[PDB]
Amino acid sequence: AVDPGPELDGGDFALPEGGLDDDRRLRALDAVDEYLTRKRKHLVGYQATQDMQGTALDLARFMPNNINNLGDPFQSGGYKPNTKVVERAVLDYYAKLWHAERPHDPADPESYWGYMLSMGSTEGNMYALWNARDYLSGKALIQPPDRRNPNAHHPVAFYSEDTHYSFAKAVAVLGVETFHAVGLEKYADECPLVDPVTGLRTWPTEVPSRPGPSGLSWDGPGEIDVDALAVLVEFFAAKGHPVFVNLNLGSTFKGAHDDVRAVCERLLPIFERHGLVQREVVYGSCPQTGRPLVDVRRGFWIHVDGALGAGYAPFLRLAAEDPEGYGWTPEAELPEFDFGLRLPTAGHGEVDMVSSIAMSGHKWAGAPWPCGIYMTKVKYQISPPSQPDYIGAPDTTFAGSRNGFSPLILWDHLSRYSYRDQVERIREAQELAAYLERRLTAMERELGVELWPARTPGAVTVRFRKPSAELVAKWSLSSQDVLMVPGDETTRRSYVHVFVMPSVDRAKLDALLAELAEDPVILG
């Protein structure tokens, strides 16, 4: 019978024609503050860091400015109250962190390009799939054949069943076809995978994730099944389709890390066998006698959805390579995932495997609103829509007006912490997630109750049985239902999770655990 506290009352905020006087205004803002303050100090169920504080002190002075980073980060524009100099410094930091080639240089196809997002990673995943759709479908690139094969400009998208819902939305928005939709449409009877529940060759809706003790993915780690991916990708690559793969680096519910290096090692030979490392691409034509114009491109695009994990994984991997220097050996290996991942081929030399990465600033770093980064390389940049106006190609971003306050937030954050400090943040979170799992299993033994605790090795989240609605509301626990046998509603379990972000300390977890021990749903 615990109290989450009162929610905000709509009548306090109704905006009348005549305006509100200063007393009613302050009362309403105080109510918002008291609400937000209580909720932020108890939030443990979402992958969003809640303590910034130094940031507010450093950056409140900028609130009077209508800052607008309209246009490309690397180009001057007319709207002078912008922070593009700060944006570039942040992008440069992450470029180095993710082993991209810097500085950005439009003359160097291998150098990075990216920009800070005005939404969260939803914007970065949309941009990634937009950029990949056009690149793989043969639209024109920024400056510096597909003969016969009718599938050459029909890209197929692959991602695991732990992929965030934003991807399904982005696929629908951009008209990108998933392997499931193309399989059902064109190849209805040819699914190369056997369903482990039914035994039938039915196209799964997403690439299977790895099984747990059950034999099915519901209690698995949440990592993509690399074997199954390879079977699916080979099938579609053999038919002549170009290939888009999204890999999750810190999945939404289980905090899993898809094994990016293993995926790439497994797929590269498939891409080489089916002519997808280098292929000539017809992009339109100009009318005379012979029609098409042609350039050379890769026929695959691997994107890393690092909304969460691109913020901490580089730091964990720093510790893994020098465990003595940082005083910490991480328990789990996190796979190589970034722009430095290169593999040798049979006959194209070393291939740099990853094409893009997104990250959310409001997840690991923390911010007062959604923000983040999309990064790729110059060689992937698409030519924007033409016009009789001139002056570079400033609009090569998803947003038009762009948030120039977000650069400040993340610049301020990154300036305050060294690499060593960032390693300690991921260390403390990893150790606290392990602690939480230990305490939950001890609770089961102390009380004689089932909590179903689960933690993927290397994840900063632990899942367990959903407690009462009031406890869930007090601590902002994110919920997920799973069916333990797909398509059977009698096997439903309700889970919550806790994300151990850097603002979650031992005291917080202990306070949650103590209420959990007396919760009426948990006690049963």
Ligand X SMILES: *[C@H](NCCCSC)c1c(COP(=O)(O)O)cnc(C)c1O
Return residues touching ligand X (CB under 6 A). Answer: 46-48, 68, 70, 119-122, 125, 164, 166, 248, 251-252, 305, 307-308, 360, 362-363, 370, 399-401
Task: Return the structure tokens found at 128.
Answer: 């990634």
Task: Return the structure tokens found at 354.
Answer: 């990853």
- C-alpha 70/C-alpha 397 separation (Å) is 9
CB-nearer residue toward ligand X: 70 or 513: 70
- C-alpha 301/C-alpha 156 separation (Å) is 10
| Interface with a copy of itself in residues 202-261 (CB under 8 A) | 252-253
Q: What are the angstrom distances between the C-alpha of 264 and each of 170, 232, 282, 303, 410?
A: 23, 14, 27, 11, 31
Size of the site for a copy of itself (CB under 8 A): 122
Does 389 help bind a copy of itself (rule: CB under 8 A)? yes
Q: Which residues contact 110 (CB under 8 A, 6 or more apart)?
A: 101, 352, 377, 378, 379
| Interface with a copy of itself in residues 67-96 (CB under 8 A) | 67-68, 78-81, 83, 85-86, 88-90, 92-93
| Interface with a copy of itself in residues 152-181 (CB under 8 A) | 164-166, 168-169, 171-175
248 binds, among a copy of itself, ligand X, none (CB under 5 to 8 A by kind): ligand X
251 binds, among a copy of itself, ligand X, none (CB under 5 to 8 A by kind): ligand X
Does 142 help bind a copy of itself (rule: CB under 8 A)? no
Task: Find the shortest distance in angstroms from Cβ 217 to a copy of itself.
Answer: 12
Contact (Cβ atoms closer than 8 angstroms) between residue 255 and residue 457: no
514 binds, among ligand X, a copy of itself, none (CB under 5 to 8 A by kind): none
Helix or strand (DSSP H, E) at 352: strand 351-352
Task: Find the shortest distance in angstroms from Cβ 122 to a copy of itself.
Answer: 4
290 binds, among a copy of itself, ligand X, none (CB under 5 to 8 A by kind): none
- C-alpha 431/C-alpha 271 separation (Å) is 39
Does 101 help bind a copy of itself (rule: CB under 8 A)? no
CB-nearer residue toward a copy of itself: 56 or 332: 56
- Candidates 107-115, 183-191, 330-338, 398-406 — which segment interacts with a copy of itself by CB under 8 A? 398-406
Does 143 help bind a copy of itself (rule: CB under 8 A)? no
Residue 269-308 contact track with a copy of itself, rule CB under 8 A, x = bound: ----------------------------------------
Q: What is the largest CA-CA distance in the chain?
A: 83
CA-wise closest residue to 476 among 46, 143, 189, 81: 46
Does 340 help bind a copy of itself (rule: CB under 8 A)? no
User: Which amino acid belongs to residue 457?
Assistant: P
Return the residue of 315, 326, 337, 411 that touches a copy of itself, per CB under 8 A: 411
Task: Find the shortest distance in angstroms from Cβ 236 to a copy of itself.
Answer: 21
CB-nearer residue toward ligand X: 401 or 491: 401
Q: What are the angstrom distances between the C-alpha of 213 and each of 69, 112, 343, 424?
A: 50, 42, 33, 33
User: Can you tell me which residue has the tokens 């500085």?
Assistant: 103
Task: Find the shortest distance in angstroms from Cβ 360 to a copy of itself.
Answer: 7
111 forms bridges with which residues in the sheet?
101
- C-alpha 333/C-alpha 342 separation (Å) is 19
99: how many CB neighbours lie within 10 A of its CB? 18
Does 490 help bind a copy of itself (rule: CB under 8 A)? no
Does 194 help bind a copy of itself (rule: CB under 8 A)? no
29 binds, among ligand X, a copy of itself, none (CB under 5 to 8 A by kind): a copy of itself
Ranges of beta strands (E only) in 400-504 are 461-465, 478-483, 492-499
Does 486 help bind a copy of itself (rule: CB under 8 A)? yes
Contact (Cβ atoms closer than 8 angstroms) between residue 219 and residue 253: no
- C-alpha 43/C-alpha 5 separation (Å) is 13
Does 452 help bind a copy of itself (rule: CB under 8 A)? no
User: Can you tell me which residue has the tokens 């991807």?
Assistant: 167
Q: What is the DSSP letter of 381?
A: P
> Which residue is nearest to ligand X, using beta carbons?
120
62 binds, among a copy of itself, ligand X, none (CB under 5 to 8 A by kind): a copy of itself
- C-alpha 215/C-alpha 447 separation (Å) is 29
520 binds, among a copy of itself, ligand X, none (CB under 5 to 8 A by kind): none
CB-nearer residue toward a copy of itself: 384 or 524: 384
Return the residue of 98, 113, 122, 255 that touches a copy of itself, per CB under 8 A: 122
Does 362 help bind a copy of itself (rule: CB under 8 A)? yes
Task: Find the shortest distance in angstroms from Cβ 13 to a copy of itself.
Answer: 4
Task: Find the shortest distance in angstroms from Cβ 46 to a copy of itself.
Answer: 5
Does 46 help bind a copy of itself (rule: CB under 8 A)? yes
Instruction: Dump the DSSP string for 397-429.
Output: SS-SS--SSHHHHHHHHHHH--HHHHHHHHHHH
Task: Find the shortest distance in angstroms from Cβ 363 to ligand X.
Answer: 5
Helical pair 506-516 and 419-447, crossing angle rounded to 10 deg = 20
CB-nearer residue toward ligand X: 155 or 370: 370
Q: Which residues contact 259 (CB under 8 A, 6 or more apart)?
A: 223, 224, 226, 335
CB-nearer residue toward a copy of itself: 293 or 469: 469
Task: Find the shortest distance in angstroms from Cβ 30 to a copy of itself.
Answer: 9
Contact (Cβ atoms closer than 8 angstroms) between residue 381 and residue 142: yes
- C-alpha 418/C-alpha 333 separation (Å) is 22
User: Can you tell me which residue has the tokens 């799964």?
Assistant: 204
User: Can you tell me which residue has the tokens 């632990």?
Assistant: 462
389 binds, among a copy of itself, ligand X, none (CB under 5 to 8 A by kind): a copy of itself
